[PDB]
Every structure is written in C-alpha cells, then in structure tokens.
C-alpha cells in the first residue's frame, strides 16, 4: 500500500528518463504503481513515455486514471489531449485542451496545444492568438514561440523579423546542446537562417523519434536479399508514399512506375494513404507491378514485414518529414538500400536512410555536409513532372490580335489545329511557331464571351470554353485528372491583369517569401516602371500583409495584383499570361517551378545553399537557360529588369523556354525513368559487391 516507497520509485524513474534510459524508467514507474495504485503522478508519467514509445492506446488509459485519481490535474488533460491528437481523434483532443484551460486558465501548455490543433486545421489566425496567449502566460516557451514563428511566416507577418530569426536560432542552439528535442520542425528548418550543422541535427533528432517507436517492437534485424536470383534478375524497387492520389507527388511522378523496364525491374508501390478516388491513384495502381495499400496495416511491424516479405532491394522514401509519413517503416530497415527521393527537400539526418537522390546543381559536393545520406546524382536534375502527359493541350498555343502579344489572349486545345483551319485568316508568326487570329467577328464573339462572363460558346462547331469555368464544364479536366476535350480561352482580363504591362508572377505559397525577397521585387518593379507583380492569396490573410510592406517600400497598391488559388489545370494554364516568373530565393518553387516552365514562362532564380533553395536553378540548368540564374541579389534584379525593359531579349528567352521545355530532358519522364534505373543499378552493384553506401557521383 506504501506511498513513500512508491514515491521513491517514481523519483528514480524520473532520473532514469533523464539519462534517456526509457527502458528502465518504464519498469520503475510500473513498480511504483504496483506499490501504490492510486498514485496520480505515476500514472501520468508512465503515460507520457508510453506515448513517446507510441503505445497510445495504453498511454491513454493511464492518463485516464491519473485524471480520475486527481481531477485537478490540468497537466494530465493537456497530454492526454496530445495523445488523442496523435490518435486522429481531434474531437477528443480538443475537449482535453479546453478542460485543461478551464480548470486552470493560467496553464500555458494547453493554450499552446490548442493553437496547434488550430494550426493543423488551417485556422492560422486563431492558432496565432492562442500561441500569443500561451507566450504571454509563459514567456520562455520554445514550442509556442517556434510554432507561432511559423504561423507568422505563413501569412507573411514580418514584425521583428530579424530579431525573431536570431531568437529561433538561439533557441535551437540551446535545445540541441542541452540534448532536448528541438522546437523547429525539420521541414521548416529550411526557412530560417540555421547552420547546415543545425538543420541536420534537427532532422537527426526527429529521426530518433522513430527509433523509440520501433525499438519497443523488439524486432530482429531483417535478412536482406543478396542477389537478384529470387527476383528473376529484376531489381525490386519499393516506392513509399502517402501521396498516391491527388497531391503534388503524383502530379510529378505518376507516370514513372508505368515507365520502368519490366525486364530488369519490378515495381512495388506502397500507399501510406487510402485510395482517394482520383485517377492519380487509379493510374499508379494500374501501372505498378504491385500496388500495396499499407494504410490497411496500421502496425509498423506488420507493414515492415510485408515489405521485407516482398523482397525489396531498394526502398524509396517519398515522404521525408511531411504529413502522412511513416518512417518507422524505414527505421525498421526492411530493405538493404533505402533512399530519399523527390518528396522531401532536405536531409533525413537519419542512419536508416542510405542515399538521397539529387543532382549536381541541387547538391554540389561543396555543400554535401548538409545531408546525412550519401548523394546519389541524377544526371541533370532529379526533379521531374507529369506535365507532358497531364497537360498536353498546352504543348501548343494560338493568340488573338486586338490592336502582337503571345500572352494577352491565349487559346489552347487539343483540337486547336483543326479549328484554326476552319478559320479564314490565320497569320502565323515564326519562332514550332504561333498562329495568330486577327480581329474577325469570331475574335469578337470569343472576346465577348469572356467579357460577358459566359461559360462557353460554339464556333463552326468547336466548343470554346471560358478558362475560368473549367470545373463547370468538366471537373476532371480542371484537376488534371483528364485532358480537356475543349478549346480554352485564357486572358489577362480574366485575372484583372493589365493588357499592356510586364507581368511578373509568383505562384508559390506566400510563406516562401521573406522581407528581402520582397525587397528585391520592389526594386525590380521600380526599375521596370510598366510592370506588375502577380501573386496568389495563399493564404488570403497574407495579402494585406504583403500589400502593407509593399507600400513602405513605396509601391502603390495597384503595382501588386492578387489572384485566388485555382484548380490545378487553370493554375498551370494561366501561367501563360505572365511574362516572367520571379522565383523565391528563400525556398524555390518546386512543383510550382515546373508548372511555370511548362507554360513557357521564363523564371529567374537565385540559388542558395539549402537544397530547397537550389531546385529552380537545377531545373533551369537542365532546361538550358543559365542566363536566368543569378549569383546574387544584384544580378537577379538585373536579369529581371533586362527582361522587363528589353523586349527583344524577352521575346528571345521566352521563345527559348517554350521550345526547350519539349526538347530538353526536363519534362521527359521516359528518359528520366531510364536514368533513375541506371542510378538504381549503380547502387545495387555497389551493395551487391559488398560495400557500404557511398556517394554515387557517376
């Protein structure tokens, strides 16, 4: 019955936990509870290591007990909430956090936890308010501070920015060195001024989280295959993604599983997510050699087995530290070779990841210590995209002359050719080359349809769709799931763009912008007097913030023009209206990059050190356009301005991008696949020859 005994035990276990020795800690707590079953704090403690070991179901039951025993235990509620949160029961997590606050209004953690839920839900403004409260209540509070900081980042609140950055760094530094799990998230790390050293460390500790979660499974190391004997000479490659369905990953690589050489390769896709219905999921399922739904198999043990089971030589992690990820699977080491690829733009910083697949531009050898994995280079760029398949109606365009611009009123359509031929007067500017519809009555009707805001019209029997109503005419087209079967009109007037300006665009989510980035753009716009910047309300709540800072830089409001976010296909297609994209140098447009290039719209970039900031450069290089790549702020602005003012040049460059986007290897997925295949072989040779992972710079 003895509380004093039980008390003592507890103290020791706390200690045991201090020295990371979770193993032992747990054993002690459970003994404490055996001596004293009505021991609130024991229950609580035990609960939170069970939580850390990922034994949620049980961890939960303990928190329940603690609370029942000691109903004023605000702390217990708050953690129990976190458990529920991780259990996907947001409903219940929410209840806990709020009970905590109600029981003890002064309790900073619950405020912060609450904010977190909001944050994950999208509601940033409320996330912020709650963080601020938590911080007011407890001013030294790293999780709060760092999350808040990212919220602010996301809506471009740049109050105290410089000094905020210092503090972040300072907090990380402190946390790392005091061996505490750092408050900045590995994915976000990429946005703040931290040493590559630090970024890597962050990734590192987050990796260890998986270790704890699989260690309690006590699984013996796996037996890995050593030859391609059992797999009939074919190397077996496992792609693991929670994004097989409508998500950027699939919009880049859906074609690839399909394009592997069956003679030498057997492809296994492991979905970490339930089939969302979309044709993305359909196609990958249709085309992979084996499609395996792991969202079915919650247990990582079982799932890891199921991989090993399949006899995978190389396992590919398309997720890194993003939503949906199950790195535990990688941490269990079911396959001999395990590589990061495509999905996540940074190091895993983790022992269980052997390679990261990248390229010479994105990750030159100078900055190789950013990464904990060995570099495996693709030959040009490691980036790829399905645009060629998804969006073949943007392979060609036509325009209308209402006075000759390539980007004022644009038509694309699979049957576009066919239609022009029914037309009387089509002049044909050379470069393929661009057909120009003169100001007929036809031209008028079209432009009138646009102006009247009508859905679509018919002309000589061809449907001519207003490219703002795509979802109304065919939602499958609008999302990328189908190729449109109409001819689509796209116009500056649709988005309230000036018919006679230089349009600089950036379609990234606004969190990729910082003060200095906006700065540069300000300078460009001042030096290109007849120009506007085109941006996305992404989130909308960020727009007034940009507008604000825009004006302290002394730009009249009307110099920056916001549009709403649009369905994948409209978003891509309307990039044809821009003259030049200006890439965020803090974090490059990745998918966004490919989308802008597909429209034929040169992009000006300023590669940094972090992988994430060198991707646009890498893409441009593969495309063949080094004159778009700045070495510094100065050069960037010049390149911008030149293209803004020298219309001759612009016409040249734009024409190049447009042609190159076909002729270069960038958007060629077949070639890409084949490259990816050699690179795989290389990796296997090297392992099958008996070596440990080493850089594959070919």
């Amino acid at each position: 019955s003895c509380p004093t005994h039980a008390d003592s035990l507890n103290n020791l276990a706390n200690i045991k936990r201090e020295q990371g020795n979770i193993e032992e800690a747990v054993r002690l707590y459970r003994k404490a509870l055996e001596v004293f079953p009505e021991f609130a704090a024991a229950h609580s403690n035990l609960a939170s290591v069970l939580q850390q070991q990922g034994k949620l179901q049980e961890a939960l039951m303990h928190y329940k007990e603690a609370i029942r025993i000691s109903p004023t235990f605000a702390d217990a509620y708050s953690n129990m909430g976190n458990t529920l949160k991780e259990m996907q029961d947001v409903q219940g997590a929410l209840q806990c956090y709020t009970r905590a606050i109600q029981i003890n209004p002064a309790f900073a953690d619950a405020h912060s936890n609450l904010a977190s839920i909001h944050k994950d839900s999208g509601n940033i403004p409320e996330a912020i308010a709650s963080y601020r409260t938590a911080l007011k209540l407890k001013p030294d509070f790293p999780d709060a501070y760092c999350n808040l900081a990212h919220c602010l980042q996301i809506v471009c609140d740049w109050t105290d920015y410089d000094e905020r950055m210092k503090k972040l760094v300072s907090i990380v530094a402190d946390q790392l060195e005091k061996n505490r799990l750092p408050s900045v998230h590995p994915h976000h790390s990429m946005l703040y001024p931290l040493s590559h050293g630090f970024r890597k460390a962050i990734a590192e500790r987050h990796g260890n989280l998986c270790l704890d979660k699989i260690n309690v499974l006590h699984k013996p190391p796996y037996e890995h295959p050593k030859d391609l004997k059992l797999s009939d000479g074919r190397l077996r490659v496992g792609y693991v993604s929670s994004d097989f369905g409508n998500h950027p990953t699939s919009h880049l690589m859906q074609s690839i599983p399909g394009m592997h050489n069956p003679d030498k390769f057997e492809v296994f896709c492991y979905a970490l997510s339930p089939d969302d219905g979309t044709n993305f999921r359909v196609k990958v399922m249709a085309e992979a050699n084996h499609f395996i739904d792991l969202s079915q198999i919650p247990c990582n043990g079982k799932a890891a087995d199921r991989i090993h089971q399949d006899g995978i030589h190389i396992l590919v992690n398309m997720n890194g530290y993003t939503k949906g990820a199950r790195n535990e699977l990688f941490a269990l080491r079911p396959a001999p070779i395990q590589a990061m690829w495509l999905g996540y733009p940074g190091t895993s910083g983790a022992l269980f990841m052997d390679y990261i697949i990248t390229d010479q531009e994105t990750s030159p050898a100078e900055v190789a210590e950013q990464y904990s994995e060995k570099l495996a280079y693709m030959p040009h760029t490691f980036f790829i995209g399905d645009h060629a398949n998804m969006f073949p109606h943007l392979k060609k365009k036509a325009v209308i002359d209402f006075k000759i611009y390539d980007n004022r009123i644009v038509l694309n359509g699979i049957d576009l050719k066919a239609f022009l031929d029914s037309l009387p007067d089509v002049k044909i500017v050379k470069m393929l080359n661009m057909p120009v519809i003169p100001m007929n009555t036809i031209a008028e009707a079209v432009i009138e349809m646009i102006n009247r805001g009508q859905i679509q019209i018919t002309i000589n029997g061809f449907s001519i769709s207003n490219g703002l109503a795509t979802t109304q005419i065919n939602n499958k087209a609008a999302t990328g799931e189908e190729v449109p079967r109409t001819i689509i009109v796209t116009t500056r007037s649709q988005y309230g763009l000036p018919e006679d300006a230089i349009v600089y665009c950036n379609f990234n989510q606004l969190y990729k912008i910082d003060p200095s980035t906006l700065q540069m753009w300000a300078n460009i716009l001042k030096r290109v007097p007849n120009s506007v910047l085109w941006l996305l309300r992404f989130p909308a709540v960020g727009e007034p913030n940009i507008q604000q800072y825009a004006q302290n830089m002394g730009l009249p409001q009307n110099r920056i023009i916001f549009s709403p976010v649009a369905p994948k296909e409209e978003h891509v297609r309307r990039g044809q209206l821009a003259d030049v994209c200006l890439d965020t140098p803090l974090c490059n447009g990745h998918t966004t990059g490919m989308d802008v290039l597909w429209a034929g719209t040169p992009m000006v970039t300023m590669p940094g050190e972090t992988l994430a900031s060198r991707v646009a450069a890498s893409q441009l290089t593969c495309l063949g356009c080094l004159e778009l790549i700045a070495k510094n702020r100065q050069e960037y602005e010049d390149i911008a301005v030149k293209l803004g003012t020298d219309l001759e040049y612009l016409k040249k460059v734009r024409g190049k991008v447009w042609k190159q986007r076909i002729s270069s290897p960038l958007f060629n997925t077949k070639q890409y696949t084949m490259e990816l295949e050699r690179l795989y072989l290389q990796m296997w040779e090297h392992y099958a020859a008996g070596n440990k992972p080493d850089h594959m710079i070919k």
Partner: peptide, 11 residues
C-alpha cells in the same frame, strides 16, 4: 474559391 493539396509540415 478552391483549395488544392500541397506539401506540408507533420507534428
């Protein structure tokens, strides 16, 4: 109008 899925955090 519209929301598109994108690459995000985790926590």
């Amino acid at each position: 109008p519209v929301s598109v899925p994108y690459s995000s955090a985790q926590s």
